[PDB]
C-alpha cells in the first residue's frame, strides 16, 4: 500500500518548503520559459 | 482439447502478491522488459530525431 494524508498523495515532496520552492520554481518556470526559448531558436535558426 | 480453465484459475489466484501483468510467471517479465525497453529507447530515439530535425541539416 501507499502513503496517505496531506502531503503524501502527490508525486512531489512538501517535507521541506525550500526544496519545494525550488521544485515548483523549476516546474512552472520551465513551462513559462519554453516559448521564449523556442522563439529564440526560430529566430536564430535562419 | 480439454478444458484446463480451472488450472489457470488456480494459477492466477495464487496469493503471491504479483500484479496481473506478471502473474503468468517469468515469461511475463521478459515480455514486459522487451516492451518497456523498446518504448523507452524508442522515445529517447524520437528525442534525438527532434534535435536533428530542429536545425537546418541534410
Amino acid at each position: 500500500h501507499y502513503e496517505e494524508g496531506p502531503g503524501k498523495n502527490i508525486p512531489f515532496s512538501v517535507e521541506n518548503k525550500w526544496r519545494l520552492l525550488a521544485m515548483m520554481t523549476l516546474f512552472f518556470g520551465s513551462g513559462f520559459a519554453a516559448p521564449f526559448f523556442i522563439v529564440r531558436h526560430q529566430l536564430l535558426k535562419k | 482439447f480439454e478444458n484446463r480453465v480451472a488450472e489457470k484459475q488456480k494459477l492466477f489466484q495464487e496469493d503471491n502478491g504479483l500484479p496481473v501483468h506478471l502473474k503468468g510467471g517469468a515469461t511475463d517479465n521478459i515480455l514486459y522488459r522487451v516492451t518497456m525497453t523498446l518504448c523507452l529507447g524508442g522515445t529517447l530515439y524520437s528525442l534525438y530525431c527532434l534535435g536533428w530535425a530542429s536545425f537546418p541539416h541534410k
Partner: protein
C-alpha cells in the same frame, strides 16, 4: 512504489492530480505565448518577425490553452477527482484506460513542441485551414506534427469520454437516478457525449489534410475536384461543440460553487439546469457554419445558421438566472471561490452577448476575422472557463491536498486577475468594430492606443499568474491541515475527509428507495 503509483496508476484521484499538474504546466506555456502575442502588438511596428513566427505563436497559444490547459484541468482533473466521489463510486469504470487518456497528453504536447521547433513552425491558426496548411504553403513536417498532436489529444479525450459516460451511467448507487446526480456530474456527462460525437469528425478532417499533404489525395485541393471549404465544415462541425465542451464543466462547477457559498443545500431549478445543459449540447451541434458566414454560402443557409445560433441564448439564460436565484436569499460567504464565480456570471454573460451579436450573419460580415471575435471568445474563455477553473481550484484545493489556502492572498489574486483580463480584452471590442483584423503582427497606426492598453492588461494578468504560484507554494509551505467544512450533507465529495483515502467507498453508500 513511486513508479507503480504515478506511472502505472489505476486510481481516479491520482490520475486527476496528474491532469491538474499537467494542465497547470500547460497554463504557464499558454500564458507565455499570450504575452509574446501582446508584446508583438504592444507598440506599432515589428518586434519578433513577420506573420509566420507571430502566427506560429498564436496557433500554439490557442492549442495549448484549449487542449492542454482547459480540457485536462476541467475534465481530466476536476472530472476524475470529483465525479466518482460525487456518486459514491469506488473509481472510474475503466481505471486502467483512464491512465492512458492521461499519458497520451505529454506525447501530444511533445508533438506540438516539435512542430514549432522544426522548419518554420505551423503558422496556420488553430483552425489549420488549407491551402495555407497544405504541403505547398506549409511544406515540411510542422503541420504534420500538429495533426498528429491533435490525433493523440483526440484519442485521449474520446477514451476519456467513454470512461466518463460509462462511469456516470453505470456506477451510481442503485437507488440514485440520473435526476439525483449533482449538476457537475451532469455537466461532465454531457461534455463527454459532445466529445464522443465531435472529435471523430475532427479526426476525419485532419486525416484528410494529412493525406492531401502526404499521399497525393485532393479532398481540399480544387485541382483534383476537392474544396477548401469542405475542410472548414468538418473542422467546425467539431469546433463549435468544442467550445461548449470548454464551458460545460465550468457551468457545472459554477453551479456547485454558487450553491455552496450561498449557504444553500441545492441549486435553484435543478431540472431546468439539466434541461439547459442538454439543450445547449444539442443545439451546439447544429450551428457550426456561423464560423463561415463570409465564405460564400447561400442566403437561406445564412438565415438558418443565424437563427439556430441565437436560440442557444434561451437555455443559457435559464442557467444565468438560476445562478442568480441560487444567490437569492443566501447567507453569502464572500470566499475567494465565490468571487471567481460571481466574476464568471457577469463576464460570461458579456461574452455570450457579443456572441449573439456575431450570430447575426449580416453584422458578422463586418465583424468576422476581426478583434471583435477575439473579444467575444476571450470573455467566455479567459473570463468564463478560466474563472470557473480558478473558482473550482480554490474551492476544492483543500479537499485534494488536505491544506488550506490563505484566503486574503487568494482574494488579492482574484482582484489582480479581474483588472488584468478586463484591461486586456475590453478594448479589443473597439479594435474589432473599427476593423482591426485577426492574426496580424502589426496594425495601421490608428489602432495604437487600444493595442497599447490591451498589452498593458496582459502584463497585469501575468502578475496574477505569478502570484498564484506563490499562493500554492505558501499553502504547501505552511501546512494548515483541514479539519471540517460546512454543508457536507449536500457535498458528498468532502465526506471522506481531506484528502480522502486512496480507496474511498470500498463499502458503498446506503441509499434506499422509499
Amino acid at each position: 512504489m513511486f513508479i507503480n503509483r504515478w506511472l502505472f496508476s489505476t486510481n481516479h484521484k491520482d490520475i486527476g492530480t496528474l491532469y491538474l499538474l499537467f494542465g497547470a504546466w500547460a497554463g504557464m506555456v499558454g500564458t507565455a505565448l499570450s504575452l509574446l502575442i501582446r508584446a508583438e502588438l504592444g507598440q506599432p511596428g515589428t518586434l519578433l518577425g513577420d506573420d509566420q513566427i507571430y502566427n506560429v505563436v498564436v496557433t500554439a497559444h490557442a492549442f495549448v490553452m484549449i487542449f492542454f490547459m482547459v480540457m485536462p484541468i476541467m475534465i481530466g482533473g476536476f472530472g476524475n477527482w470529483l465525479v466518482p466521489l460525487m456518486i459514491g463510486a469506488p473509481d472510474m469504470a475503466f481505471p486502467r484506460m483512464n491512465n492512458m487518456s492521461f499519458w497520451l497528453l505529454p506525447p501530444s504536447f511533445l508533438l506540438l513542441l516539435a512542430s514549432s521547433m522544426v522548419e518554420a513552425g505551423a503558422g496556420t491558426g488553430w483552425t489549420v485551414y488549407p491551402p495555407l496548411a497544405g504541403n505547398l504553403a506549409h511544406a515540411g513536417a510542422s503541420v504534420d506534427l500538429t495533426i498528429f498532436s491533435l490525433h493523440l489529444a483526440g484519442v485521449s479525450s474520446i477514451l476519456g469520454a467513454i470512461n466518463f459516460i460509462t462511469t456516470i451511467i453505470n456506477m451510481k448507487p442503485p437507488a440514485m437516478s440520473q435526476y439525483q446526480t449533482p449538476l457537475f456530474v451532469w455537466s461532465v456527462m454531457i461534455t463527454a457525449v459532445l466529445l464522443l460525437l465531435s472529435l471523430p469528425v475532427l479526426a476525419a478532417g485532419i486525416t484528410m489534410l494529412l493525406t492531401d499533404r502526404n499521399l497525393n489525395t485532393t479532398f481540399f485541393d480544387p485541382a483534383g475536384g476537392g474544396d477548401p471549404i469542405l475542410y472548414q465544415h468538418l473542422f467546425w462541425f467539431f469546433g463549435h461543440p468544442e467550445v461548449y465542451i470548454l464551458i460545460l464543466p465550468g457551468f457545472g462547477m459554477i453551479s456547485h460553487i454558487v450553491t455552496y457559498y450561498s449557504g444553500k443545500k441545492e441549486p435553484f431549478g435543478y431540472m431546468g439546469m439539466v434541461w439547459a445543459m442538454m439543450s445547449i449540447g444539442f443545439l451546439g451541434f447544429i450551428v457550426w457554419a456561423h464560423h463561415m458566414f463570409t465564405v460564400g454560402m447561400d442566403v437561406d443557409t445564412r438565415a438558418y445558421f443565424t437563427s439556430a445560433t441565437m436560440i442557444i441564448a434561451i437555455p443559457t439564460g435559464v442557467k444565468v438566472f438560476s445562478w442568480l436565484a441560487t444567490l437569492h436569499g443566501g447567507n453569502i460567504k464572500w470566499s475567494p471561490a465565490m468571487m471567481w464565480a460571481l466574476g464568471f456570471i457577469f463576464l460570461f454573460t458579456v461574452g455570450g452577448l457579443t456572441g449573439i451579436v456575431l450570430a447575426n450573419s449580416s453584422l458578422d460580415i463586418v465583424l468576422h476575422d476581426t478583434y471583435y471575435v477575439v473579444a467575444h471568445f476571450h470573455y467566455v474563455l479567459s473570463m468564463g472557463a478560466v474563472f470557473a477553473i480558478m473558482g473550482g481550484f480554490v474551492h476544492w484545493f483543500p479537499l485534494f491536498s488536505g491544506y488550506t489556502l490563505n484566503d486574503t492572498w487568494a482574494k488579492i489574486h482574484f482582484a489582480i486577475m479581474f483588472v488584468g483580463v478586463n484591461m486586456t480584452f475590453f478594448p479589443q471590442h473597439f479594435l474589432g468594430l473599427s476593423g482591426m483584423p485577426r492574426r496580424y503582427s502589426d496594425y495601421p497606426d490608428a489602432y495604437t492606443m487600444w493595442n497599447t492598453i490591451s498589452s498593458m492588461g496582459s502584463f497585469i494578468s501575468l502578475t496574477a499568474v505569478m502570484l498564484m504560484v506563490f499562493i500554492i507554494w505558501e499553502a504547501f509551505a505552511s501546512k494548515r491541515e483541514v479539519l471540517t467544512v460546512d454543508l457536507t450533507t449536500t457535498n458528498l465529495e468532502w465526506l471522506n475527509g481531506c484528502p480522502p483515502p486512496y480507496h474511498t467507498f470500498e463499502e458503498p453508500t446506503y441509499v434506499n428507495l422509499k
